[PDB]
Write an enzyme that holds these catalytic residues in place. Structure first.
Site, PDB file in Angstrom:
ATOM      1  N   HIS A  92       7.462  10.666 -31.074  1.00 37.28           N
ATOM      2  CA  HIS A  92       6.510  11.093 -30.096  1.00 37.28           C
ATOM      3  C   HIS A  92       7.302  12.132 -29.197  1.00 37.28           C
ATOM      4  O   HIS A  92       6.833  13.000 -28.434  1.00 37.28           O
ATOM      5  CB  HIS A  92       5.872  10.418 -29.196  1.00 37.28           C
ATOM      6  CG  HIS A  92       6.632   9.469 -27.952  1.00 37.28           C
ATOM      7  ND1 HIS A  92       7.017   8.293 -28.088  1.00 37.28           N
ATOM      8  CD2 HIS A  92       6.894   9.951 -27.196  1.00 37.28           C
ATOM      9  CE1 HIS A  92       7.741   8.011 -27.057  1.00 37.28           C
ATOM     10  NE2 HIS A  92       7.815   9.014 -26.356  1.00 37.28           N
ATOM     11  N   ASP A 152       6.939   5.235 -34.700  1.00 38.15           N
ATOM     12  CA  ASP A 152       7.351   6.073 -33.745  1.00 38.15           C
ATOM     13  C   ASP A 152       8.973   6.337 -33.945  1.00 38.15           C
ATOM     14  O   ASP A 152       9.741   5.517 -33.226  1.00 38.15           O
ATOM     15  CB  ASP A 152       7.118   5.639 -32.256  1.00 38.15           C
ATOM     16  CG  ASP A 152       7.240   6.647 -31.228  1.00 38.15           C
ATOM     17  OD1 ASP A 152       6.895   6.298 -30.172  1.00 38.15           O
ATOM     18  OD2 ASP A 152       7.471   7.825 -31.575  1.00 38.15           O
ATOM     19  N   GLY A 162      11.194   9.535 -20.187  1.00 35.70           N
ATOM     20  CA  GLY A 162      12.432  10.044 -20.218  1.00 35.70           C
ATOM     21  C   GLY A 162      13.540   9.096 -20.877  1.00 35.70           C
ATOM     22  O   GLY A 162      14.702   9.593 -21.422  1.00 35.70           O
ATOM     23  N   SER A 193      12.575   7.205 -23.618  1.00 36.32           N
ATOM     24  CA  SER A 193      12.097   7.215 -24.947  1.00 36.32           C
ATOM     25  C   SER A 193      12.710   7.685 -25.881  1.00 36.32           C
ATOM     26  O   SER A 193      13.478   8.652 -25.683  1.00 36.32           O
ATOM     27  CB  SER A 193      10.486   7.816 -25.175  1.00 36.32           C
ATOM     28  OG  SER A 193       9.541   7.236 -24.450  1.00 36.32           O
ATOM     29  N   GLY A 194      12.763   7.318 -27.256  1.00 37.69           N
ATOM     30  CA  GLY A 194      13.893   7.861 -28.000  1.00 37.69           C
ATOM     31  C   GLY A 194      15.250   6.951 -28.105  1.00 37.69           C
ATOM     32  O   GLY A 194      15.573   7.133 -29.089  1.00 37.69           O
TER      33      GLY A 194
END
Ligand code: NA
Length: 240
Positions: free
Chosen positions: A45, A93, A186, A188-189
């Site tokens: 995402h 994801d 912020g 995420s990932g």
């Protein structure tokens, strides 16, 4: 990260900042994990938008020269083919970013080690989330890399009705949910680092939090379970 503490600058050397070009500057948008000298693992995402991305390794303070950063362009983006941006709860994801150059390794820049395929953490396993994401719901990004202790919440609990119900899948890891500490926008990932047999490994890629807020009791932060994607990761790297 809500309810975090500042990380020591050499604690989490696989953490990266994924940034996009914004006018004459760069803006942090997501985290990631360095998994090869020229590959980063992040959330799908995070790369939905048609932006120009770079990765920063050796980053500590987004807003100050650390003297340790390497800045590298993203050359290729490989999103999981089952990802659907209309449907984060379905999973998948995860994305791999091939960097334009291979970074140099040092105490600030190291590869993240990944778990063995299929590994599932016992309930309440010790983990840390790291990132530069918001420090409060509807707040602002951290300047300095934050960490928060988020013990895992197993699938049986996480997928129960008062937690996430049907929205959490077995291809995810849940951690936290105490109402004080969490991932936030912020983050995420980025990684969820879990201590197993004496060694931290990256078991999660931060995926989502509640629409009702970041640190919400019984809504633990949800991560893509890296150990479900080992073959996928290896296949992408081998074919690129
Ligand atoms: Na910096």
């Amino acid at each position: 990260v809500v309810g975090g503490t500042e990380a020591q600058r050499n604690s989490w050397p696989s953490q990266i900042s994924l940034q996009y070009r914004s006018g004459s500057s760069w803006a942090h948008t997501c985290g990631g994990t360095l998994i090869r000298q020229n590959w980063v693992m992040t959330a799908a995402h995070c790369v939905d938008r048609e932006l120009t991305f770079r990765v920063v390794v050796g980053e500590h303070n987004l807003n100050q020269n650390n003297g340790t950063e390497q800045y590298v362009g993203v050359q290729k983006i490989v999103v999981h083919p089952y990802w659907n941006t209309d449907d984060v709860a379905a999973g998948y994801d995860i994305a791999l970013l091939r960097l334009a150059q291979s970074v140099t390794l040092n105490s600030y820049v190291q590869l993240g080690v990944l778990p063995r395929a299929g590994t599932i953490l016992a309930n309440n396993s010790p983990c840390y989330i790291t990132g530069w994401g918001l420090t409060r719901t509807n707040g602002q990004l951290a300047q300095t890399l934050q960490q928060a202790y988020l013990p895992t919440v197993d699938y049986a609990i996480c997928s129960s009705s008062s937690y996430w119900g049907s929205t959490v899948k077995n291809s995810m890891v849940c951690a936290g949910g105490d109402g004080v500490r969490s991932g936030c926008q912020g983050d995420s990932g980025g990684p969820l680092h879990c201590l197993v047999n004496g060694q931290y490994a990256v078991h999660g890629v931060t995926s989502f939090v509640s629409r009702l807020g970041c640190n919400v009791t019984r809504k633990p932060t949800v991560f893509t379970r890296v150990s479900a994607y080992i073959s996928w990761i290896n296949n992408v790297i081998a074919s690129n």
